[model samples]
Target: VPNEPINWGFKRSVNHQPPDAGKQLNSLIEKYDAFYLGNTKEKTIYLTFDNGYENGYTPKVLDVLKKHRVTGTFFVTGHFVKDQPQLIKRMSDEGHIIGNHSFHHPDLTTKTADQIQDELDSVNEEVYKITGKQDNLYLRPPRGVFSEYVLKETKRLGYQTVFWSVAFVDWKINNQKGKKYAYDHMIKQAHPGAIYLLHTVSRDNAEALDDAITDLKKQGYTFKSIDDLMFEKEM
Candidate 1:
C-alpha cells in the first residue's frame, strides 16, 4: 500500500463553515497543520494573497493593506521573490510575512519527496536572499493541489501548509468582472477565522480591496495574518 496523490480543484462557491465538499480539502486538515478556517465563532479573518507573478497590481494591494492597517501573509514563488526584490522588501518592511509558495509553482501532489523538498527550500532561500529574512514557514500548494503525502513533506520541512476558505474567479485577467464583483464575493463569503485566498495580480482585487476591508470591519471582522491563525490554539 502506498500514498495515493489527490488532485485538487477549486469551486466557485463554498460553505460558510468546514465540510467543504468542493475538492475534499477538509479530508487532509486533521493529519496536517493545514487549515481552511479557524475559531468559527471569532470575528477574525486570516488574510493571504497568492503571488503567482507580478502584474503591476501588488503595489496597489499593498497600499490598501497599509491604508486599512492590516497585515497579511503573501505566498510567493522564487521568480516573484527574485524578480520583485523591492516589492518583496516592502512587504517585509511593512511587518508582513512572506510565505514560500515554491520555486516553480509545481503541483506538489505529483512530486516525489526530493522534488517537494527542493521546491520548498529553493523558494525559501530566494525570499531570504532578497529580504534577508528566513522565517517563511508557511506554504500553500500551487493551484490548491495537495495530498496527504504532500502535507507530510511540508510538515517535515517545518512548514504549515495553508489552504483557503474563500476565493473567486479573479485570477484570470481577461475574465475579471469588476471591483463590485470582487467586493461582493469578499463580503458575502466572509466568515470568522476564515483564510481568504486572493490573488494580488488581479486589478479588480486591488480596486475593491479597500471597500471590502471597510465593509468587513462594519461586520465586526478583523484582519489577521496567517501567523495569528497558526497560533490560534495558544491564544
Candidate 2:
C-alpha cells in the first residue's frame, strides 16, 4: 500500500480540554500500536524532550526535573548519544526514559524499512554502550514526519512511535520568547493524557520547567514517563 506522509499536529487545547488529533489519524496510527495522547480521563502529563543537538541548556532542564522528582522521556539522535554520553548516563541513572529519535534524524517516510531499523538501532546501541540499558522501545519520528508505512515498520521493529498532544514554537534557540511564554503555553494547553514536546535547546523551557511542573502539580496533574503511559494502557 502506498502511504502518504503525515505531519503530526493537533489543535491546541482550550479551557483545559484535550485537543483532538483527529479521529481518522488516530485510528490509523492505533492500528500499528502508535499513539499521541495517553489516558485522557486521568490527570497525568507525559513530559518528553527531543535532543537533536546540545545547546548548553539540558543540565538545567535535568536539574529542574530532578528537584521536582519528575521523570521525563528524552529522545536523542545518534549525534546526541555520541556527543553527550555523560548526559545520557545521567539521564539513565536518574531514571529518565531515553527514547530513540533516530540516528541521523532523517524523515522516516523517506527511508526504507531497513534504513529505519538501522536509524533506530544505531541510537539504541550507543545508548546501551553508555548507559548499559538494553531496552529502547519508544521512538519519536524525526520532525514529526511519518507515514502509515513508517509506523508499521517501526512497530514491526518493536518500537512504539510516539507523537505529542501538546507542543509550541519553542525549538528556535535564537528566538526564545521568554520564561513566561513557555510557561503560559504549557499551563494553558495542559490536559489529562497530554504528552508535552519540548526541546532542550531552548533556554525558556529550561527556566520555565520548574515553575510549570510546580504549577501543574498544584493543578492535580502528576508527571509520568512513557513507560507509565504504556502500562496504564494495559489496565
Candidate 3:
C-alpha cells in the first residue's frame, strides 16, 4: 500500500494511549520505524533534546541530568557537533545517547531519497570524527516533519525515526516564558509513554529541567533514554 507523502504536524495531543495519528501512521508504515509514544505498560517518559546550535545552556542541562542520574537523547546536527565538540564529548562521557538530527536540518519530506541520505551520512561522519564513536542511528526529522518515502529511506539506512508526543513553542529564544511556564507546558502535558521533545538551546528549558524531573519523579514517572526505549524489545 504505497501512500502519498505526509507532512507531519508538530502540534501534539498526548494522552494515556498513542494518539489517533500515531496509531494510523504507524500502522500504515511497517518495518519503517517511527514512534510518537512508547506502547508500554510502564509510567515512563523518554527525554530527547534537539541540538540545532549551542546557546550555552547545554552545560546546565547536562548538569541537571547528571545530578538526577538520568540520561537524555541529544539529537544534533553537523554544525552543532562540529562547533561544540567539548559539549558533545561531555555528553558522551556522561553516558547520554547521541542522536542524529541531520547535517543541515532540512525537512525530510521535500528531499529525494539520496538527498536525505547525504544529510544523515555527513552528520554520521562528523559525529564519529568528534565523538570517536558512532552514535545510535536514531533520528528525529527536522521540525518533526517526515513522509512515507522519508521513513522508507531512513529505515533502509537503519535509522529509527523518532517523533515526540509532547512539545511546545520553546524553541524561539526571544519568546521564552521562563521556568514556570516551561514546567506547566512540559509537566502538565506529560502522559504515560510520552516522548518529551525539548530544545537544548532553550534557556527556559534548561532552567526548568531540574524542577521538571523532580516533579515528574514525584508523580511516579521514570525517565528512559532512547536507547532503552528503542531496543527494549530486541533485548
Candidate 4:
C-alpha cells in the first residue's frame, strides 16, 4: 500500500489526490469536522493546510501568515519533513500546530489495516525526528477518503482522524477563472462552527486568506485551533 494513489476520476499525473469520491466517503457533509464533530456550538473556524510537497508557495504562505500574525495548522507529509524542513520548523516556531497528513498521501480506505498503520507510523516518526514536537495524534486522511476500517485503525493507533466540515473548489492551479467567485462563495457561506479546508497552492487563497480572516473577525467569529474549535482539542 506504499505510495498507493487514489483515483477519483481526476488526472492521475497531477492534483495528486482524486476528485470527489462522494460515493466511497464515510463521513457526511454535516458530520465532517476536525478533532470533534458533536459540539456544534459558538462560531469558530479551523484553518488547515493540506500539504503535499515543496511547491515554492508554502514559504510565501508562511510569510503572509507572519504578516497577518494569524496562526494555522499544517497537515504535513513525511517527504515534506525531509524536504524544506525549515518550513516545518518555521511552522512550529510560529506557534502553528503540525498534524500528520501521512507518509505518501495514500488513500487509507483501500489499504489493508497493516498498510494504514505503516503509513501513520512512518509519517509520525519522520515528523518527530525533525520537529522534536510530539507527533500529532490528529490524522487527516489523504484527500479525505476514509472508511470504517480507517476510522477503527486511527482510533486503535491513539489518533483522532480529522475531516473538514466545509471546503471550496480551490485546488486547481490553472485558470482559477472564478477564483474571486469561489472566494466570495466561501466568505458568504461562513457560519458558526465551521472547519474550512484549504490548499496552500492556490494564490487566490493566499491573497484572500488575510482578508477572509479579517472579514470573519469583523463578523464576530473567533478562530480556534482544531482542538479548541472541536471538542477533541482546543486553541
State which candidate has the highest TM-score: 2
Q: Tell how far residue 222 is off in model 1, in angstroms.
A: 0.9
lDDT of each: 0.80, 0.89, 0.81, 0.66
Displacement of the residue 166 alpha carbon in candidate 1, Å: 0.1
Tell me each candidate's TM-score.
0.91, 0.97, 0.91, 0.78
Taking the tens digit of each residue's C-alpha lDDT, what string does model 3 give over 1-235?
2435575553455554434465566674455787777745788898998998988789999999999999999999988988998998899999998899999998777787788889999987887777788866898888777667778888899998887777787888887777887888777777778888898666567779899899999989999888888677466
Query: For model 1, what is the error of residue 195's alpha carbon versus the real structure, in angstroms, after optimal superposition?
Result: 0.7
- In model 4, where do residues sit more than 4 Å from their true spots? 1-39, 230-235
Better of 2 and 4 by TM-score: 2
**Clashes by residue pair, model 2:** none
lDDT of 4 by residue, 105-217 (tens): 87777777788788888877776666787734788888766655566667778777666655666777775644475567557656555556777776556667767777778
Best by lDDT: 2
lDDT of 2 by residue, 11-94 (tens): 889988888888888798768878888889899999999998898889889999999999999999999989999999999999
Report the alpha-carbon TM-score of model 2 versus the true structure.
0.97
**Predicted structure 1, TM vs. truth:** 0.91
Clashing residue pairs, backbone N/CA/C < 3 A, model 4: 227-233, 227-234, 228-233, 228-234, 228-235
lDDT per residue (tens digit) for residues 1-235 in model 1: 1356655444434454432544455666776777777667788888889887898889989998999999989999888888899999999999899888899998777788998899989987777777788764988888777777788878987888888878887888787687998899888887777778888766667878889999899979888887777676667
